[PDB]
Amino acid sequence: QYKKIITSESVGAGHPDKICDQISDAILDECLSQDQNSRVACEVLACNRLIVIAGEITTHAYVDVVKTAWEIIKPLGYDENDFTIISNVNKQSVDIAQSVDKTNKNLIGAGDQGIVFGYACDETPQYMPLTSVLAHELLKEIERQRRSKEFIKIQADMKSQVSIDYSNSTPLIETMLVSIQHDEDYDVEYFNKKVSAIMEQIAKKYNLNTNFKKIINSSGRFVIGGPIGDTGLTGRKIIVDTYGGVGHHGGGAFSGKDPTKVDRSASYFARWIAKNVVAAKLAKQCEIQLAFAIGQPQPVAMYVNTFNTNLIDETKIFEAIKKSFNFDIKTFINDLNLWTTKYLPVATYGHFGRDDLDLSWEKLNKVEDLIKNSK
Amino acid sequence: KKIITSESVGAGHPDKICDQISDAILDECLSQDQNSRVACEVLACNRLIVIAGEITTHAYVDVVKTAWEIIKPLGYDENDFTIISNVNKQSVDIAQSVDKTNKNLIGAGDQGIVFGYACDETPQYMPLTSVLAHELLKEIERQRRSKEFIKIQADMKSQVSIDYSNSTPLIETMLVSIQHDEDYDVEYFNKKVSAIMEQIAKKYNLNTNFKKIINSSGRFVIGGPIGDTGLTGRKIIVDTYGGVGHHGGGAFSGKDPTKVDRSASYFARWIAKNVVAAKLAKQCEIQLAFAIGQPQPVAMYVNTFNTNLIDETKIFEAIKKSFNFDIKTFINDLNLWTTKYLPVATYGHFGRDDLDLSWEKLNKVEDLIKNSK
Amino acid sequence: YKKIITSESVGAGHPDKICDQISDAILDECLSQDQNSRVACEVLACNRLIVIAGEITTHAYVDVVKTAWEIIKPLGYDENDFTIISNVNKQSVDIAQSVDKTNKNLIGAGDQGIVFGYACDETPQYMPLTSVLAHELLKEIERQRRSKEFIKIQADMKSQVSIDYSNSTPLIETMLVSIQHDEDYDVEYFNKKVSAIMEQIAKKYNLNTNFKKIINSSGRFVIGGPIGDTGLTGRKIIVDTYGGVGHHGGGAFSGKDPTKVDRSASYFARWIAKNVVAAKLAKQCEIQLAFAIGQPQPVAMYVNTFNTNLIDETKIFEAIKKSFNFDIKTFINDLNLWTTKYLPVATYGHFGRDDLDLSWEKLNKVEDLIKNSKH
Ligand SMILES: C[S@@+](CC[C@H](N)C(=O)[O-])C[C@H]1O[C@@H](n2cnc3c(N)ncnc32)[C@H](O)[C@@H]1O
Ligand SMILES: C[S@@+](CC[C@H](N)C(=O)[O-])C[C@H]1O[C@@H](n2cnc3c(N)ncnc32)[C@H](O)[C@@H]1O
Ligand SMILES: C[S@@+](CC[C@H](N)C(=O)[O-])C[C@H]1O[C@@H](n2cnc3c(N)ncnc32)[C@H](O)[C@@H]1O
Ligand SMILES: C[S@@+](CC[C@H](N)C(=O)[O-])C[C@H]1O[C@@H](n2cnc3c(N)ncnc32)[C@H](O)[C@@H]1O
Ligand SMILES: C[S@@+](CC[C@H](N)C(=O)[O-])C[C@H]1O[C@@H](n2cnc3c(N)ncnc32)[C@H](O)[C@@H]1O
Ligand SMILES: C[S@@+](CC[C@H](N)C(=O)[O-])C[C@H]1O[C@@H](n2cnc3c(N)ncnc32)[C@H](O)[C@@H]1O
Ligand SMILES: [Cl-]
Ligand SMILES: [Cl-]
Ligand SMILES: [Cl-]
C-alpha cells in the first residue's frame, strides 16, 4: 500500500547482543566507581557456551569480570556452569593515551575520529520517535511480567518491532510485532492473549488506536534462545540503542566505553542539544551531527538539521546553540557528569528518552538559554 | 659407581606455576566450604592460562585474582596472560559413589594406586638426592626475592647426582639451570651458583669437591610459559620421591581430600615415615590400591627392600594395628580438610622440615613399636 | 602376608588419553611433512573445550581441528561438541641453539632429566603381568564396542589388576573394570559381558579364573569423557610405562619429537633393559639415565638387576656400554624415531606391545650383549 510506514525495533535483556552490552557497561561501571580516570573500551562476545571479555583497559581499579558477568546472566536464568569465560583485557595503547591526555593544556583530546548524531522530536513526552518508544515499552512490560510471574512459561530472549503510519498528521499504529522465547510446554492460546493485551495496554497508554495488525511469534517456535541460538557481541544494537532508524547514525557503539570515547560522550551531548532545541519550541525535530579528530579537544564539524520544522530562522537556532553550549570535550563531559553516571541502566531499552531514569543528557536545563540566545 | 639422580624445579617453572594456581584455587574453596569437591587443572602456554576442572562448592573463588597472586611475585603482570575460566561441576555419578548414604563413610573418589616412601638418609626421612635438589632451588629463589642474587628470573631447574658406592654418600654432580637477564654478568652468576651449591653441601656435611654444571644450555633468557608449556600434575616425581620411590601416576595439586590420589598418598607417606622412624626398616614403601566408591583400600603391599630390621610380617601386622584404613577416618586423622596445600605445590609434598605437615608427624612411632611385639 | 601388586590401564575415551592421542596425532602429521620438526604439543580437554598448545617449529602445516576430530569422532563426539583453541607457539630459540649443535653430527639433549627403562621375564612382552592384563582387558572391551559384540557402552573406561605374587606361580587376586554405559543399559547383560572378558583374558595367560571381580563399583557411569573429568596430555605416565613396578623420572612422552630425551631416551633405555633380560643376563633389569640440556650423551647411568643377575653386575654394565651407542643423535637414528608413528602408542602403553612393531622392542642386541659379557 502507498503509505509512510516507519518501523523501529527493540530487544530484551536476554537477547545475546544485549547481554554483551550489559556485561560491557557493568564492567565499565565497576571501573569508574573505583577510578574516575580509568580508560575503558570493553567488548564482549557471547556464543553458545563461551563469553569472551576483551578490549583495552588502563585503570587502578580491579573488576571481577566473572562475578560481573554472573550478575547479568543469573537474572536471565543462567547459572555458574553455563559458560566458559575468557578474560583478555589488554591495556590502552600509549599512543592513543598521549593524544587524549593533553596534560600540558588542561584539555581532553577526542579518543578517536568519528561522526555522531543527536536527535529529538516532539512525538512523545520522551522527545523520541514513537516507533522506538512503543517497541521498548512492549519489551519492558513483558520482562517486568516475566520477573513478577504475571506472564509465565517465557524466557528472557525477546524482540519487538513497531510500525507506525505517519501518512497523515496523527500517527496510527500499523503493526506491533513481538517474538518471545517460550518454554516447551507453553500454552500458545494463553501466550497470544497475554501478548495481545500487553500490546493494547501500551497503545492505550499513548492514546493510540488498538486495531493494528499483531504479529506474535511468527517463527512458530522459539524454545532455543540466548547465546545458544545466536551469537551476541557488544555494539551490534546501535540503532535500538539510539533512535530506531528515524535518526541517522555515525556507526559508533556506546557500551563499555569511558567518556573520553566521543562516540559515547558526544552522542549524549548531541542528544542533550537536540532535545533542548525541540523542548524550547525552536523546531519539531532536530538532528545534530558532530565530527571529531583524534587528539583534538573540539569537534572539527557540526551540522544542525531541523527537517523544515524550524519555527524561527535556522541561522538563529545555530547561533543560539553556539551561545548556549560549550563544545570543549572535557567541559561537556563534566557538564553531563559522565564520570559519575551509571551506564548499566542504559545498556537495555535505549540510551535516550528514558522517563524511567534520570540521565544528565535528558535534562531540559538549556531551554531558557536557547530561548534567550535565539532573539 | 652407584650414581642415583633426582631433580627439582622452581616456583617460576611453568608446570609448577600450574600446580600453584591449582592448589591456590583449592585452598580458597576449602577456606569457604570444607565439603567442597574440587579437581582444578591448569594449563599455561605462551600468553594463555586455562583454569579448568570440576568443582562443586558453596564457595566462590576469583580465579583471575588467584592466578595473579601466583604470577605477580614471579615478575608477570595483569596484561601478560589471557585467562580462561572453564569450571564445570563434579559429575553427579561420581558424587553419589563418594558421598555415601551411610553418612559415616566416604567412598574413594577414583580407582588407583598410590605409593608412600621413606628412608633414613636425611632428617626429613627422604632421599638425599631430592632433598639437595630442592634446597638448591629454595636458596636461589630466596636470594632472588631478597636481591642477594641479582639479574635472575624465577624459572629454574636443578638435578643432583649422588654416589652411593660406599657407606658414606658422596655428591657426584650438582646441576642448576636458572633463567637470567640478557645483561647478566656470567662470571658473577657462576660464582653465586657455585657458592650456593657449596653452602648446601656443607649444610648436609657432605663433600664440596663435586662436579658443577651451571647453565649447560649456555643461554636461558626466554623462560616460563613463553619458553615451555606448563600443566598441572606434570611434575609428579619432583612432587614425591625423585625417582627413588615408585609412583602410581596420580597428581596431587588442585584435588580435595576425597581424591585418594592425594589423601592416600599422604597417608601412605605418614605410614612409611613412621615405620622408618620406629627403626623397623631403613627404607619402606607402601602401595595402596583403591576402587571408586569403596571406603577402604582393596590392596596393600609393604616393601622394605631387604632393609627390614625385624620380620616383614611383623611390620605388616604392626601397620594394620596402628593405622585406620577407612578413608573418611584417615582424612580426618590428617586434618586434610583444613590443611593449606599451596605450600606443598613447590619443592615437594614430603619431608618438608620447613613446614608443619600432618603426614610428616612422627606420632605413630610408639604405636608401631608396641604393635610390632 | 599375601604379596599383592596392582597396575592400571585406561581406554581410548578416557579424557587424559584423548589428549595424549591428539598430541601424538599432531606430532605424526608434523613429522610426515618435515622430519626436522621440533614439536612439544600439549592438549587439555574439559567439559566442552579442547586446547591445543605447546611449542612447534616446523615447515609443516597441521590442521589441528581436523586432527582433533579424527581422534574424537570414533569415540562418538561430533563437530559441535567442543570449542577448539589453537595456541601454537614456536620453540624457544635459546633451547634450539643448545640442541642443534653447530657440529651437525650432534644433537644436544632437549632438557635435563632422568628416565628409566625396565624389563622383566614375567610375560612374552617382557613386562609386568599386572600391566599386560590391565591393558588387554580394555583392548578387548574397546574391540567389542567397535564390532558391536558389546552393546550399550561408551569409550571412557579404566581397569586395574591385582596379582598375588606370594607363590612361584602368580595368581590373579582381583580384576576391576569401570566402563561408561548408556542410560538404558541392562546391568545383568553388562556384568556377564565384563565377567566373560575378564575370564577370557585370564585364560589367554593360563591363569586362574576364580578371582575377585569389581565391575562398575561406582554403581553408575553415564557421564564420562571430558564432561566427567578433565584430561591433559602426560597425566597417565605410569599407565604409559610399567604400571608402578618400574621407576619413573616424571617425563611424559606424547606430543614430543625425538630430540626430547624424555621420550627418546626412555625408549632407548627400554630397548637396553629388554635385551638384557632376553639375553638371560638377569630376570629383571632397570636402567636409569640422566641428562643435561645441550649435552649429547647422558651425564649418569645406573643399572639395577634386583639381585636377579645371572653373571656379575660389573660385566652386565660393561656389556651394555660395549653393545649400545649412547650418543643421542645416534640412538635416535638407530631406533628410527624420526619415521616411527606415535599415535599407536598413545593408548595401551608404549612398551611390550606385541600388537605393534616398535624399534625399541626388538631383540636385536641379544647377540651383542652375550658376546660382550664374556670377556
Ligand atoms: C588490575 S589493574 C589495577 C591494579 C592495581 N590496583 C593498580 O592500581 O595498579 C592494572 C591493569 O590490569 C589490567 N587488567 C587485566 N584484567 C583486569 C581487570 N579484570 N580489572 C582491571 N584491570 C585489568 C588493566 O590493563 C589494568 O590497567
Ligand atoms: C533469529 S536470530 C539470528 C540468525 C541466527 N544467528 C541464525 O544462525 O540464523 C537473531 C535473534 O532472533 C531471536 N531468535 C532466536 N531464535 C528465534 C526463533 N526461533 N524465533 C524467533 N526469534 C528467534 C533472538 O533474539 C536472536 O538473538
Ligand atoms: C559459585 S558456587 C557457590 C554459589 C552459592 N554461594 C551457593 O552456595 O550455591 C556454585 C557453583 O559455581 C560453579 N563455579 C563456576 N565457576 C566457579 C568459581 N569461580 N568458583 C566457585 N564455583 C564456581 C561450581 O560448579 C559451583 O558448585
Ligand atoms: C627445556 S624446556 C622443555 C622443551 C620445550 N618445550 C621445547 O619446545 O623444546 C623445559 C624446562 O627447561 C627449562 N628451560 C627453558 N628454556 C631453557 C634454556 N634455554 N636452558 C635451560 N633450561 C631451559 C624451563 O624450566 C622449562 O620448563
Ligand atoms: C605454518 S608453519 C610452516 C609455514 C611454511 N610452510 C614454512 O615452511 O615456513 C610455520 C610456523 O607456524 C607455526 N604454526 C602455527 N600454527 C601452526 C599449525 N597449525 N601447524 C604448523 N605450524 C603452525 C609454527 O610455529 C611453525 O614454525
Ligand atoms: C573418577 S574421575 C576423576 C575425579 C573427578 N575429576 C572428579 O571431579 O571427582 C577419573 C576417571 O574415572 C572414570 N570415571 C568418570 N566418571 C565415573 C563414574 N561415574 N564411575 C566410575 N568411573 C568414572 C573416567 O575414566 C574419569 O577419567
Ligand atoms: Cl538480532
Ligand atoms: Cl620440564
Ligand atoms: Cl584418571
PDB file of N, CA, C and O and ligand atoms in Angstrom, chain A residues 11-12 14-17 157-159 179-181 217-226 229-231 237, ligand 2:
ATOM      1  N   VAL A  11      15.011  -4.918  21.645  1.00  0.00           N
ATOM      2  CA  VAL A  11      15.351  -6.287  22.073  1.00  0.00           C
ATOM      3  C   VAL A  11      15.394  -6.345  23.564  1.00  0.00           C
ATOM      4  O   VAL A  11      15.556  -5.327  24.229  1.00  0.00           O
ATOM      5  N   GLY A  12      15.250  -7.553  24.106  1.00  0.00           N
ATOM      6  CA  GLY A  12      15.109  -7.671  25.554  1.00  0.00           C
ATOM      7  C   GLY A  12      16.426  -7.918  26.254  1.00  0.00           C
ATOM      8  O   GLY A  12      17.506  -7.967  25.635  1.00  0.00           O
ATOM      9  N   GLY A  14      17.564 -10.526  27.699  1.00  0.00           N
ATOM     10  CA  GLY A  14      18.167 -11.804  27.356  1.00  0.00           C
ATOM     11  C   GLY A  14      18.536 -12.033  25.906  1.00  0.00           C
ATOM     12  O   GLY A  14      19.023 -13.085  25.515  1.00  0.00           O
ATOM     13  N   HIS A  15      18.404 -10.999  25.115  1.00  0.00           N
ATOM     14  CA  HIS A  15      18.898 -11.014  23.757  1.00  0.00           C
ATOM     15  C   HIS A  15      20.449 -11.068  23.834  1.00  0.00           C
ATOM     16  O   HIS A  15      21.012 -10.315  24.582  1.00  0.00           O
ATOM     17  N   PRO A  16      21.122 -11.869  23.032  1.00  0.00           N
ATOM     18  CA  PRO A  16      22.526 -12.101  23.206  1.00  0.00           C
ATOM     19  C   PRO A  16      23.406 -10.849  22.992  1.00  0.00           C
ATOM     20  O   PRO A  16      24.374 -10.648  23.701  1.00  0.00           O
ATOM     21  N   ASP A  17      23.024  -9.983  22.016  1.00  0.00           N
ATOM     22  CA  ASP A  17      23.793  -8.735  21.823  1.00  0.00           C
ATOM     23  C   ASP A  17      23.643  -7.836  23.066  1.00  0.00           C
ATOM     24  O   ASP A  17      24.597  -7.205  23.512  1.00  0.00           O
ATOM     25  N   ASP A 157      14.981 -13.910  26.307  1.00  0.00           N
ATOM     26  CA  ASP A 157      15.338 -13.524  24.925  1.00  0.00           C
ATOM     27  C   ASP A 157      14.054 -13.123  24.218  1.00  0.00           C
ATOM     28  O   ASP A 157      13.081 -13.884  24.188  1.00  0.00           O
ATOM     29  N   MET A 158      13.998 -11.931  23.679  1.00  0.00           N
ATOM     30  CA  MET A 158      12.808 -11.397  23.010  1.00  0.00           C
ATOM     31  C   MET A 158      13.149 -10.197  22.137  1.00  0.00           C
ATOM     32  O   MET A 158      14.208  -9.545  22.337  1.00  0.00           O
ATOM     33  N   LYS A 159      12.300  -9.907  21.194  1.00  0.00           N
ATOM     34  CA  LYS A 159      12.464  -8.795  20.234  1.00  0.00           C
ATOM     35  C   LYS A 159      11.098  -8.221  19.946  1.00  0.00           C
ATOM     36  O   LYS A 159      10.078  -8.912  20.039  1.00  0.00           O
ATOM     37  N   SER A 179       8.454 -11.224  19.289  1.00  0.00           N
ATOM     38  CA  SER A 179       8.876 -12.618  19.398  1.00  0.00           C
ATOM     39  C   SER A 179       9.456 -12.834  20.781  1.00  0.00           C
ATOM     40  O   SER A 179      10.358 -12.085  21.170  1.00  0.00           O
ATOM     41  N   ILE A 180       8.958 -13.842  21.521  1.00  0.00           N
ATOM     42  CA  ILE A 180       9.385 -14.108  22.892  1.00  0.00           C
ATOM     43  C   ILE A 180       9.767 -15.552  22.991  1.00  0.00           C
ATOM     44  O   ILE A 180       8.981 -16.419  22.582  1.00  0.00           O
ATOM     45  N   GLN A 181      10.958 -15.815  23.527  1.00  0.00           N
ATOM     46  CA  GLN A 181      11.382 -17.168  23.792  1.00  0.00           C
ATOM     47  C   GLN A 181      10.417 -17.781  24.833  1.00  0.00           C
ATOM     48  O   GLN A 181      10.111 -17.167  25.893  1.00  0.00           O
ATOM     49  N   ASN A 217       5.119 -14.130  17.595  1.00  0.00           N
ATOM     50  CA  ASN A 217       5.944 -15.308  17.390  1.00  0.00           C
ATOM     51  C   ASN A 217       5.784 -15.917  15.985  1.00  0.00           C
ATOM     52  O   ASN A 217       5.469 -17.081  15.835  1.00  0.00           O
ATOM     53  N   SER A 218       6.109 -15.123  14.993  1.00  0.00           N
ATOM     54  CA  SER A 218       5.977 -15.511  13.602  1.00  0.00           C
ATOM     55  C   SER A 218       6.798 -16.715  13.224  1.00  0.00           C
ATOM     56  O   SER A 218       6.504 -17.336  12.208  1.00  0.00           O
ATOM     57  N   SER A 219       7.894 -17.020  13.917  1.00  0.00           N
ATOM     58  CA  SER A 219       8.674 -18.229  13.558  1.00  0.00           C
ATOM     59  C   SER A 219       7.925 -19.485  13.838  1.00  0.00           C
ATOM     60  O   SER A 219       8.238 -20.508  13.293  1.00  0.00           O
ATOM     61  N   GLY A 220       6.981 -19.397  14.784  1.00  0.00           N
ATOM     62  CA  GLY A 220       6.156 -20.546  15.171  1.00  0.00           C
ATOM     63  C   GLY A 220       6.780 -21.384  16.241  1.00  0.00           C
ATOM     64  O   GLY A 220       6.101 -22.263  16.716  1.00  0.00           O
ATOM     65  N   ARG A 221       8.068 -21.196  16.588  1.00  0.00           N
ATOM     66  CA  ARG A 221       8.672 -21.918  17.680  1.00  0.00           C
ATOM     67  C   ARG A 221       9.986 -21.221  18.058  1.00  0.00           C
ATOM     68  O   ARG A 221      10.836 -20.979  17.187  1.00  0.00           O
ATOM     69  N   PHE A 222      10.154 -20.938  19.339  1.00  0.00           N
ATOM     70  CA  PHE A 222      11.295 -20.176  19.850  1.00  0.00           C
ATOM     71  C   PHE A 222      11.570 -20.700  21.228  1.00  0.00           C
ATOM     72  O   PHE A 222      11.265 -20.071  22.241  1.00  0.00           O
ATOM     73  N   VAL A 223      12.124 -21.905  21.251  1.00  0.00           N
ATOM     74  CA  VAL A 223      12.487 -22.545  22.517  1.00  0.00           C
ATOM     75  C   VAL A 223      13.998 -22.380  22.737  1.00  0.00           C
ATOM     76  O   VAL A 223      14.413 -21.971  23.806  1.00  0.00           O
ATOM     77  N   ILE A 224      14.799 -22.667  21.740  1.00  0.00           N
ATOM     78  CA  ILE A 224      16.238 -22.377  21.733  1.00  0.00           C
ATOM     79  C   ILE A 224      16.401 -20.838  21.654  1.00  0.00           C
ATOM     80  O   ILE A 224      15.792 -20.214  20.804  1.00  0.00           O
ATOM     81  N   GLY A 225      17.203 -20.270  22.541  1.00  0.00           N
ATOM     82  CA  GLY A 225      17.450 -18.846  22.509  1.00  0.00           C
ATOM     83  C   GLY A 225      18.691 -18.479  23.307  1.00  0.00           C
ATOM     84  O   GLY A 225      19.573 -19.326  23.607  1.00  0.00           O
ATOM     85  N   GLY A 226      18.805 -17.184  23.517  1.00  0.00           N
ATOM     86  CA  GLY A 226      20.025 -16.600  24.045  1.00  0.00           C
ATOM     87  C   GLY A 226      21.232 -16.877  23.192  1.00  0.00           C
ATOM     88  O   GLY A 226      21.096 -17.170  21.977  1.00  0.00           O
ATOM     89  N   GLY A 229      21.173 -19.883  20.629  1.00  0.00           N
ATOM     90  CA  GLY A 229      20.552 -19.692  19.390  1.00  0.00           C
ATOM     91  C   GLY A 229      21.203 -18.684  18.453  1.00  0.00           C
ATOM     92  O   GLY A 229      20.939 -18.748  17.221  1.00  0.00           O
ATOM     93  N   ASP A 230      21.980 -17.762  18.991  1.00  0.00           N
ATOM     94  CA  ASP A 230      22.526 -16.676  18.207  1.00  0.00           C
ATOM     95  C   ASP A 230      23.676 -16.011  18.976  1.00  0.00           C
ATOM     96  O   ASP A 230      23.525 -15.735  20.158  1.00  0.00           O
ATOM     97  N   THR A 231      24.732 -15.687  18.282  1.00  0.00           N
ATOM     98  CA  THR A 231      25.887 -15.021  18.856  1.00  0.00           C
ATOM     99  C   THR A 231      25.635 -13.579  19.157  1.00  0.00           C
ATOM    100  O   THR A 231      25.050 -12.850  18.327  1.00  0.00           O
ATOM    101  N   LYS A 237      23.706  -3.467  18.492  1.00  0.00           N
ATOM    102  CA  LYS A 237      22.334  -2.966  18.512  1.00  0.00           C
ATOM    103  C   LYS A 237      22.304  -1.459  18.561  1.00  0.00           C
ATOM    104  O   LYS A 237      21.601  -0.844  19.382  1.00  0.00           O
TER     105      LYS A 237
HETATM  106  C1  LIG D   2      16.879 -15.126  14.519  1.00  0.00           C
HETATM  107  S1  LIG D   2      18.409 -14.910  15.289  1.00  0.00           S
HETATM  108  C2  LIG D   2      19.652 -14.648  14.055  1.00  0.00           C
HETATM  109  C3  LIG D   2      20.177 -15.597  12.895  1.00  0.00           C
HETATM  110  C4  LIG D   2      20.871 -16.799  13.534  1.00  0.00           C
HETATM  111  N1  LIG D   2      22.214 -16.417  14.051  1.00  0.00           N
HETATM  112  C5  LIG D   2      20.976 -17.932  12.571  1.00  0.00           C
HETATM  113  O1  LIG D   2      22.034 -18.632  12.738  1.00  0.00           O
HETATM  114  O2  LIG D   2      20.134 -17.999  11.654  1.00  0.00           O
HETATM  115  C6  LIG D   2      18.500 -13.292  15.955  1.00  0.00           C
HETATM  116  C7  LIG D   2      17.624 -13.108  17.166  1.00  0.00           C
HETATM  117  O3  LIG D   2      16.241 -13.551  16.905  1.00  0.00           O
HETATM  118  C8  LIG D   2      15.763 -14.163  18.050  1.00  0.00           C
HETATM  119  N2  LIG D   2      15.501 -15.613  17.767  1.00  0.00           N
HETATM  120  C9  LIG D   2      16.292 -16.714  18.004  1.00  0.00           C
HETATM  121  N3  LIG D   2      15.722 -17.868  17.719  1.00  0.00           N
HETATM  122  C10 LIG D   2      14.455 -17.409  17.320  1.00  0.00           C
HETATM  123  C11 LIG D   2      13.214 -18.100  16.886  1.00  0.00           C
HETATM  124  N4  LIG D   2      13.261 -19.400  16.846  1.00  0.00           N
HETATM  125  N5  LIG D   2      12.138 -17.460  16.606  1.00  0.00           N
HETATM  126  C12 LIG D   2      12.168 -16.121  16.714  1.00  0.00           C
HETATM  127  N6  LIG D   2      13.191 -15.354  17.038  1.00  0.00           N
HETATM  128  C13 LIG D   2      14.336 -16.008  17.397  1.00  0.00           C
HETATM  129  C14 LIG D   2      16.846 -13.957  19.187  1.00  0.00           C
HETATM  130  O4  LIG D   2      16.552 -12.698  19.824  1.00  0.00           O
HETATM  131  C15 LIG D   2      18.163 -13.877  18.397  1.00  0.00           C
HETATM  132  O5  LIG D   2      19.105 -13.036  19.016  1.00  0.00           O
END
